[PDB]
Write an enzyme that holds these catalytic residues in place. Structure first.
Site, short mmCIF file in Angstrom:
data_model
loop_
_atom_site.label_atom_id
_atom_site.label_comp_id
_atom_site.label_asym_id
_atom_site.label_seq_id
_atom_site.Cartn_x
_atom_site.Cartn_y
_atom_site.Cartn_z
N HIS A 128 3.91 12.73 -32.92
CA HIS A 128 5.12 13.22 -32.27
C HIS A 128 6.25 12.32 -32.70
CE1 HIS A 128 3.83 10.54 -28.91
NE2 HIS A 128 5.13 10.50 -28.57
N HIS B 158 8.38 10.09 -31.18
CA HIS B 158 8.79 8.82 -30.58
C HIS B 158 8.49 7.66 -31.54
CE1 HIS B 158 8.47 10.61 -26.26
NE2 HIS B 158 9.66 10.80 -26.76
N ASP C 249 6.81 4.93 -31.25
CA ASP C 249 5.44 4.49 -31.37
C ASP C 249 4.60 5.33 -32.35
OD1 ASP C 249 5.73 6.34 -29.11
OD2 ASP C 249 3.66 5.87 -28.50
N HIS D 246 2.78 15.49 -23.33
CA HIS D 246 3.62 14.31 -23.34
C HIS D 246 4.97 14.58 -24.00
CE1 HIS D 246 4.86 10.22 -24.17
NE2 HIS D 246 5.04 10.62 -25.42
N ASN E 5 5.11 7.29 -20.10
CA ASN E 5 6.53 7.61 -20.27
C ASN E 5 6.71 9.11 -20.40
OD1 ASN E 5 9.19 7.81 -20.95
ND2 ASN E 5 9.15 5.88 -22.10
C1 LIG Z 1 8.46 4.85 -27.36
C2 LIG Z 1 7.88 5.63 -26.16
C3 LIG Z 1 7.35 4.63 -25.08
C4 LIG Z 1 7.97 3.43 -24.73
C5 LIG Z 1 7.43 2.57 -23.76
C6 LIG Z 1 6.27 2.87 -23.05
C7 LIG Z 1 5.61 4.11 -23.36
C8 LIG Z 1 4.47 4.79 -22.85
C9 LIG Z 1 3.52 4.29 -21.83
C10 LIG Z 1 2.15 4.38 -22.05
C11 LIG Z 1 1.28 3.91 -21.11
C12 LIG Z 1 1.69 3.32 -19.95
C13 LIG Z 1 0.72 2.79 -18.92
S1 LIG Z 1 0.26 4.09 -17.75
C14 LIG Z 1 -0.41 5.50 -18.61
O1 LIG Z 1 1.45 4.52 -17.07
O2 LIG Z 1 -0.75 3.66 -16.87
C15 LIG Z 1 3.06 3.21 -19.78
F1 LIG Z 1 3.51 2.64 -18.63
C16 LIG Z 1 3.98 3.68 -20.70
C17 LIG Z 1 4.37 5.96 -23.58
C18 LIG Z 1 3.48 7.13 -23.43
O3 LIG Z 1 3.19 7.51 -22.23
O4 LIG Z 1 3.10 7.79 -24.43
N1 LIG Z 1 5.36 6.01 -24.45
C19 LIG Z 1 6.17 4.93 -24.34
N2 LIG Z 1 8.90 6.54 -25.61
C20 LIG Z 1 10.30 6.35 -25.57
C21 LIG Z 1 10.79 7.41 -24.75
C22 LIG Z 1 12.27 7.56 -24.40
N3 LIG Z 1 12.66 8.90 -24.60
C23 LIG Z 1 13.24 8.94 -25.99
C24 LIG Z 1 14.44 9.67 -25.44
N4 LIG Z 1 14.32 11.12 -25.66
C25 LIG Z 1 14.05 9.15 -24.09
O5 LIG Z 1 9.76 8.21 -24.29
C26 LIG Z 1 8.56 7.66 -24.77
O6 LIG Z 1 7.50 8.12 -24.61
ZN LIG Z 2 5.81 9.47 -26.88
ZN LIG Z 3 3.15 7.13 -26.58
#
Ligand SMILES: C[C@@H](c1cccc2c(-c3ccc(CS(C)(=O)=O)c(F)c3)c(C(=O)O)[nH]c12)N1C[C@H](CN2CC(N)C2)OC1=O
Ligand SMILES: [Zn+2]
Ligand SMILES: [Zn+2]
Length: 232
Positions: free
Chosen positions: A85, A87, A89, A150, A181
């Protein structure tokens, strides 16, 4: 020393590989985002005498370190990469890949989203994935579009030789307490998309989430559970 790596055991700015099955590894790296540190996973699949990479290591320097780690541990060239996807990561590091000889691919939807958001953009479009339930072959893997979860563009990857299901960020680890996220997520569709994965890959033996520990098929149901309660 053989346990699945975590942020506490990856030295600063490094990447670790983990052998999943014959010819299948995950890669693990860590990154800072909004003042917190997170792990993330990707996949490496042997493709004859070459390697297919699934997802970057979440940033340019991490992705350079990934390439070095692959050279050290495996010693076969990475020739192609797929980002699952848009993002950072998944795509952050695509420019590094592209300057190291790697041909980078993603769906047209991922490429549009990456471009719009100012993320790095894979070069090549993967057609045949625009409808929920679609699947295409790509070297030693099958790529599958389950529907929005997601993100609206998220792909999953299946390694049929090993029955490895790489869920990417559409699948969460068993310890998860919320759906991660969700900024770009479709919480209402996500369970339906997970059901599609479960129906299409019932013989999966290992399931790898986008972040955290691999396990078995239970990761899929757990994901649906945490998403439904996050939405509620
Ligand atoms: C770059 C990415 C991103 C960054 C930091 C953390 C995560 C997380 C994330 C994953 C696990 C946990 C622990 S847990 C399941 O909660 O126990 C958690 F706490 C978090 C995931 C995910 O869940 O895959 N990904 C992240 N980004 C950026 C983003 C912003 N968007 C872009 C704009 N359009 C606004 O959105 C996203 O996913
Ligand atoms: Zn993502
Ligand atoms: Zn992710």
């Amino acid at each position: 020393s053989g346990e699945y790596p975590t942020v506490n055991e990856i030295p600063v700015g490094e990447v670790r590989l983990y052998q999943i099955a014959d010819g299948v590894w995950s890669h693990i790296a860590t990154q800072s985002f909004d003042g917190a540190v997170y792990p993330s996973n990707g996949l490496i699949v042997r493709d004859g005498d070459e390697l297919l990479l699934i997802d970057t290591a979440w940033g340019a320097k991490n992705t350079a370190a990934l390439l070095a780690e692959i050279e050290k541990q495996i010693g076969l060239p990475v020739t192609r990469a797929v980002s699952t996807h848009f993002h950072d990561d998944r795509v952050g590091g695509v420019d590094v890949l592209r300057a190291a000889g790697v041909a980078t691919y993603a769906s047209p939807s991922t490429r549009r989203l990456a471009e719009a958001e100012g993320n790095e953009i894979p070069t090549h479009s993967l057609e045949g994935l625009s409808s929920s339930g679609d699947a295409v072959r790509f070297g030693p893997v099958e790529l599958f579009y389950p529907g929005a979860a997601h993100s609206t563009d998220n792909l999953v990857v299946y390694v049929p030789s090993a029955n490895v299901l790489y869920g990417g960020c559409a699948v969460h680890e068993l310890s998860s307490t919320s759906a991660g996220n969700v900024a770009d997520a479709d919480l209402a569709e996500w369970p339906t998309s997970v059901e599609r994965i479960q129906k299409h890959y019932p013989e999966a033996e290992v399931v790898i989430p986008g972040h955290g520990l691999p396990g078995g098929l239970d990761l899929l149901q757990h994901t649906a559970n945490v998403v439904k309660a996050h939405k509620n």
